[PDB]
Write a protein that binds this ligand. Structure first.
Ligand SMILES: CC(C)(COP(=O)(O)OP(=O)(O)OC[C@H]1O[C@@H](n2cnc3c(N)ncnc32)[C@H](O)[C@@H]1OP(=O)(O)O)[C@@H](O)C(=O)NCCC(=O)NCCS
Ligand SMILES: CC(C)(COP(=O)(O)OP(=O)(O)OC[C@H]1O[C@@H](n2cnc3c(N)ncnc32)[C@H](O)[C@@H]1OP(=O)(O)O)[C@@H](O)C(=O)NCCC(=O)NCCS
Ligand SMILES: Nc1ncnc2c1ncn2[C@@H]1O[C@H](COP(=O)(O)OP(=O)(O)O)[C@@H](O)[C@H]1O
Ligand SMILES: O=P([O-])(O)O
Ligand SMILES: [Mg+2]
Ligand SMILES: [Mg+2]
Lengths: 1035, 177, 94
């Protein structure tokens, strides 16, 4: 949002970036002092500290320092050290805040007169920024809002320097008007370019020598970090004085900043017994309120929220933080954890609850020890599944968990937990003809809209096309009841607009980074009359520019940071209302007579539930969004509702802060608003009078008492608005109003018609275990679904930790066994000897031919591999099979030799072209020797070597070759390594595991050749005709 | 052989391509001298996603074990890893957008392999750059995965699995009239 | 799904104008006769099997076997009643 920065951070950026003709004096002359300051180091970096007299003051967001005697003026460095001796590290009380004086700033003393002190301030508002100037600056400036010269720089307007001179610098000394004008002009551009929301210089000192910035008080638009990170640097946002920050708060802040989700946490009382983990910014407040109202104010430990669809992991990281924090010390009455929320629109409840359940399992020991009782109440996408997992973790751990759904009133679990109650501009925006373009790839949102449309009995779908810049133009499949339809997806918005002139609404799912530009672009297509901006986190400044353009172009903006709205029977903005089951539950397929407006998207979904149960239903509902300046405000929509004949009553869900809600009082008074209005402003707490101490002179005044929810609620009730006792009475008062209106004939409720039926989604039915569908596939080698990859039961980390190697991994994937080390080493050895055997072989030849014919690696490799099997590469398998058969049949080696001769068969794995009994094959030597050394038993190898004794006695080159050696050795390894049964070993041979060895092994050689030919830049091959014998038929 | 090849023939573009793609993309960006942030924005403007960035579940807080194993070996044994350093800096930027925009195993292998060729001292730059171009990285994936595929083949035979016919329910027939 | 089959019957009666009176399992089979005629108003071993019995199914009857297994489950049997199947055309498999 807009966060306060230190006087040092401010002066740094100022000195660094302010561009002016005015000579700014003492640039970068400033030194920071803490209790850990090395004075020798400080003096090394700031030699100017000895050059002149100094001024020392604390840099801890302490206002009115001078008046508190916290400013040591005109001192030598020795005098500064003497001044700090009693102050540095000391506790200090500034108003109702008590903290330590840890951070100080030293600056050179500026000799000047009181006449030479000035006041400048710039601050943003919805209409542009105000520049204030006063010629009586100093610690005695007073009410600067009334006293000073105001000037508004409009939204996309430039600060004209003639206007500065003309109006701001009216009472400034004539001789200093040009320098002041030059500085103010430059300051305004610096304020703009660095995304400040507030920047105040008091005093600004202008002497015969030049301009001096003696004090800074500035707030930046923290959300604008993505732009300014480069200029801002490692910008730190200090917590207000007295408040001492916690490491847990800093952690959650980091998670929030690095994601599109909202994760907030603030500790109230670390030693409190009431802990809350509520979903949604609206609900969080309402729960905090209910606890305060039931006396738990002093026992309330925190105020936080999680929303914007966080991942299971993010929810886990959030939950573990809360659980860690509540299990630090024991309470005599135990503790409470309120896991609440309203009915969600898009936050997947099944998914988020799995994260929380994981954190509860990890902290089950401390949670039982600290006697923690959990109360859950949540609705929304797949809430059914998420509630089941909650009940189940309570049973399996022993922790008491009480789980409730949409049927329970939101705030009912608070009284349950505390033991008070038992545990059981355009008026019309949308029509039934409205067609929209969805910017972004949001399949679930689009389908959601289309299911709402079908049940509303719409003749056509509300989504005409989608815009997604990363893919080329294509069509996406969707469901119109049970009929499949295609929706076009465009790379360019220009094309979408051109092909779809019927579209007048744009739903913008662009990210905060992409959002501004995409909206601005849409405004160039006049057909678009309403834009819904979903993104939460757009810098305030960029939104003001979107408001300015939309206002001048007549386009209605719903958002930013909104879920949207819903017009039952007509149109629903993206995810508003959530899944069909909620649309049906809250009877949103047909209209009622009640119209509502809310800031919170989550509370909007709770309002649909409340209104449906108490009245004839919702006519139209809008969530205006939560950003500082919304595109459309409460009044904008209240007036639309007042002017819509179908609306018979209006419900407004207000909030603490702002004065928007007072425009309604005014409207009623003026007689503009005649329809009955029901209103509740949330945030009746701050009973803990934190009373955020005013940032500087400019803001400091107004009336922060009127802004409060308690004040607004009183004001509105007196105004004639129907205001409930508390949020828990809101249903009763809405029902009370509706009953009077039906009684007075203002409302004539219509008979109920059943909506068109849509089939359940398979995904969903399977989740609830309602249907069973047999799997078509069966696997047993690898599981990629887990946290970790699993190879045949062994997780990948264990594979490396146990040093398995390629051989080891092959054992798991091919045999699903943890093989002995010798076995693995042997497999690796096989793969090495079979790697290559020159380019003359059938396979290598094809791969080379292929590579030479300009093909890719995979084509070239496959072309070669496809020759492996029979006459080429077959021998390994063949030999193993042949010898196994013979051995197992019980025939002696000589009987075998003769059997083969008689059958007219040659022995597989016997014979060599050159190698003989006197000239051995090295590959066979290497392998024989490894096997002899490391294999416990080698009976088949022994048998084969005896056959070799017989064949070599015939012809000397009839040696056991490498294919035969590997064959028999492999059989001996399977049978005698002790990992396989006889059946298992025999099946593996038969199914061709041995072929796999040769194929995998030789694959290396083939890739080798492919690369080689490419590297050798070898041209296309054509076989010479002279090598071809053409024997064609006679004509 | 038929079963293995049938599977291997899918490797190349949308499946198995990422290692080569990541290596090539990051090498180009690094060698061009653009800083990681300039690179991230260049890609956004060109309407291209970064090859070797992103994961379905794994995030910055919940790391991919395969990437962890490899990252750690590489840091410990490689003399220099400039491209990996560059890629990890790109990852710092993307994870700051969405937490699951991590450097994945395809990206890790790609850039690690480039660093190995360039800085192991066995190859000239020309040699290292030619090997990447002629597709040595594709060879790694193909050879590597070939084991898994042979694994599946044996498994299906051992599981005595019958002929597959795709169910008509999963097919959307959109023929002319 | 007799409930929906009885719905199409009732619907054809309404759309054509023909009087059709539709009844289910709750009506005795032969009760419609009396209604139609206007007599009543229109509104070795003793033990063969145990919970331990295991059988062999000769033939490739997937639906029959699954049917048996669903009955066994719903009867809260500890084990399925089908131990194996015999089909002479295929090799041994699961
Ligand atoms: C805005 C929202 C719809 C989409 O946000 P998201 O999923 O984080 O955003 P994207 O899908 O566009 O992805 C984020 C970025 O990752 C980038 N990215 C994704 N994969 C990438 C890859 N492999 N390589 C490079 N970049 C990649 C995208 O380009 C995108 O960049 P950008 O932010 O500069 O446009 C979502 O955050 C949301 O629902 N927010 C809730 C806000 C809310 O509270 N609403 C109000 C209800 S009250
Ligand atoms: C007679 C002569 C011309 C040919 O003799 P030779 O080359 O040694 O004989 P062959 O080519 O028939 O081969 C010798 C034996 O090796 C056998 N043999 C060859 N390859 C074999 C293999 N892979 N597996 C098993 N037996 C094999 C042949 O069956 C033959 O068996 P036999 O002697 O019982 O008939 C020669 O000995 C000569 O010049 N004599 C004088
Ligand atoms: N560098 C300085 N040289 C001279 N006077 C200074 C200097 N810094 C502060 N002062 C004087 O001290 C007063 C109080 O300091 P200031 O920064 O305005 O703190 P605060 O407004 O919070 O009390 C100023 O109004 C000014 O008169
Ligand atoms: O976070 P919410 O208040 O917009 O629901
Ligand atoms: Mg001051
Ligand atoms: Mg929110």
């Amino acid at each position: 949002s807009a966060k306060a920065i230190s006087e040092q951070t401010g002066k740094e950026l100022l000195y660094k970036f302010i561009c002016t003709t005015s000579a700014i004096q003492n640039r970068f002359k400033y030194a920071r002092v803490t209790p850990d300051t090395d004075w020798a180091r400080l003096l090394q970096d700031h030699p100017w500290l000895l050059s002149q007299n100094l001024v020392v003051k604390p840099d801890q967001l302490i206002k009115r320092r001078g008046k508190l005697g916290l400013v040591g003026v005109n001192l030598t460095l020795d005098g500064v050290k003497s001044w700090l001796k009693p102050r540095l590290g000391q506790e200090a009380t500034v108003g109702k805040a008590t903290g330590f004086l840890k951070n100080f700033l030293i600056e050179p003393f500026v000799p000047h007169s009181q006449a030479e002190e000035f006041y400048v301030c710039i601050y943003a508002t919805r209409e542009g920024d105000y520049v204030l100037f006063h010629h009586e600056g100093g610690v005695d400036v007073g009410d600067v809002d009334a006293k000073a010269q105001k000037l508004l720089v409009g939204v996309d307007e430039k600060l004209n320097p003639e206007d500065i001179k003309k109006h701001l610098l009216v009472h400034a000394p004539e001789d200093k008007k040009e320098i002041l004008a030059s500085f103010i002009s430059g300051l305004f551009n610096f304020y703009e370019d660095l995304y400040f929301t507030y920047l105040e210089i008091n005093p600004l000192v202008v002497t015969k020598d030049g301009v001096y910035v003696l004090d800074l008080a500035a707030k930046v638009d923290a959300t604008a970090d993505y732009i300014c990170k480069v200029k801002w640097g490692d910008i730190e946002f200090p917590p207000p004085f007295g408040r001492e920050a916690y490491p847990e708060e800093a952690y959650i802040a980091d998670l929030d900043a690095k994601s599109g989700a909202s994760l907030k946490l603030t500790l109230l009382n670390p030693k409190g017994r009431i802990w809350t983990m509520v979903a949604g910014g609206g609900a969080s407040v309402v729960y905090s309120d209910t606890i305060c109202d039931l006396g738990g104010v002093n026992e309330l430990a925190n105020y936080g929220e999680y929303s914007g669809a966080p991942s299971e992991q993010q929810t886990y990281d959030y939950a573990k933080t809360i659980l860690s924090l509540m299990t630090r010390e024991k309470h005599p009455d135990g503790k409470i954890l309120i896991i609440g929320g309203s009915i969600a629109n898009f936050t997947n409840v099944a998914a988020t609850f799995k994260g929380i359940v994981r954190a509860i399992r990890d902290y089950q020991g401390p949670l039982k020890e600290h006697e923690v009782t959990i109360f859950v109440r949540r609705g929304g996408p797949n809430y059914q599944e998420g509630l089941r997992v909650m009940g189940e973790v309570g049973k399996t751990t022993g922790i008491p968990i009480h789980v409730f759904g949409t049927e329970t009133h939101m705030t009912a679990i608070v009284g349950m937990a505390l033991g008070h109650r038992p545990i059981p501009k355009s008026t019309t925006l949308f029509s039934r003809h409205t067609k929209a373009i969805v910017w972004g790839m949001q399949t679930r949102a689009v389908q959601g809209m289309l299911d709402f449309d079908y049940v509303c009995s719409r003749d056509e779908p509300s989504v005409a096309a989608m815009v997604y810049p990363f893919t080329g133009d294509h069509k996406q499949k969707f469901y119109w009841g049970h009929k499949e339809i295609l929706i076009p997806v465009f790379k360019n918005m220009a094309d979408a607009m051109r092909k779809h002139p019927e579209v007048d609404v744009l739903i913008n799912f662009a990210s905060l980074r992409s959002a501004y530009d995409s909206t601005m672009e849409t405004m160039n297509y006049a057909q678009i009359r309403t834009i819904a901006i979903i993104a939460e986190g757009i810098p305030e400044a960029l939104t003001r520019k979107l408001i300015k353009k939309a206002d001048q172009k007549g386009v209605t903006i719903i958002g930013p940071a909104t879920v949207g709205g819903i017009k039952p029977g007509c149109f629903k903005i993206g995810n508003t209302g959530g899944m069909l089951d909620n649309i049906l539950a809250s009877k949103l397929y047909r209209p009622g007579s009640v119209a509502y407006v809310s800031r919170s998207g989550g509370m909007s979904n709770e309002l649909n539930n409340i209104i449906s149960r108490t009245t004839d239903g919702v006519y139209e509902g809008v969530a205006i969004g939560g950003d500082r300046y919304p595109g459309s405000t409460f009044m904008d929509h209240v007036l639309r509702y007042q002017d819509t004949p179908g609306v018979k009553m209006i419900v407004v869900l207000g909030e603490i802060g702002g004065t928007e809600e007072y425009k309604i009082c005014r409207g009623i008074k003026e007689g503009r608003l005649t329809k009955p209005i029901v209103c509740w402003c949330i945030g009746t707490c701050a009973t803990m009078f934190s009373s955020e101490v005013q940032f500087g002179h400019a803001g400091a005044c107004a009336n922060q008492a009127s802004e409060t929810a308690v004040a607004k609620n009183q004001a509105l009730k007196e105004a004639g608005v129907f205001v409930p006792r508390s949020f828990d009475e809101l249903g009763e008062i809405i029902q009370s109003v509706y009953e009077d209106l039906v009684a007075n004939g203002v409302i004539v409720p219509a008979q109920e018609v059943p909506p068109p039926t849509v089939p359940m989604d398979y995904s969903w039915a399977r989740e609830l275990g309602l249907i069973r569908k047999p799997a078509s596939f069966m696997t047993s080698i690898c599981d990629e679904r887990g946290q970790e990859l699993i190879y045949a039961g062994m997780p990948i980390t264990e594979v490396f930790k146990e040093e398995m190697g390629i051989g080891g991994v092959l054992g798991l994937l091919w045999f699903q066994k943890r093989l002995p080390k010798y076995s693995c080493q042997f497999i690796e050895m096989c793969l090495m000897v079979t790697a290559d055997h020159g380019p003359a072989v059938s396979g290598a030849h094809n791969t080379i031919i292929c590579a030479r014919a300009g093909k890719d690696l995979v084509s070239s490799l496959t072309s070669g591999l496809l020759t492996i099997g029979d006459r080429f590469g077959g021998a390994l398998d063949a030999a193993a099979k042949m010898f196994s058969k013979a051995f197992d049949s019980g025939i002696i080696p000589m009987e075998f030799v003769n059997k083969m001769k008689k059958e007219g068969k040659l022995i597989m794995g016997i014979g060599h072209r050159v190698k003989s009994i006197n000239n051995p094959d090295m590959r066979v030597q290497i392998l024989k020797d490894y096997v002899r050394q490391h294999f416990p038993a080698t009976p088949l190898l022994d048998y084969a070597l005896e056959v070799e004794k017989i064949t070599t006695s015939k012809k000397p080159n009839l040696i056991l070759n490498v294919d035969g050696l590997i064959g028999v050795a492999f059989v001996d390894m399977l049978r005698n390594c002790g990992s396989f049964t006889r059946e298992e070993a025999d099946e593996y041979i038969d199914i061709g595991a041995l072929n796999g060895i040769f194929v995998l092994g030789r694959s290396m050689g083939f890739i080798g050749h492919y690369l080689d030919q490419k590297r050798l830049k070898q041209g296309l091959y054509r076989h010479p005709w002279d090598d071809i014998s053409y024997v064609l038929p006679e004509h």
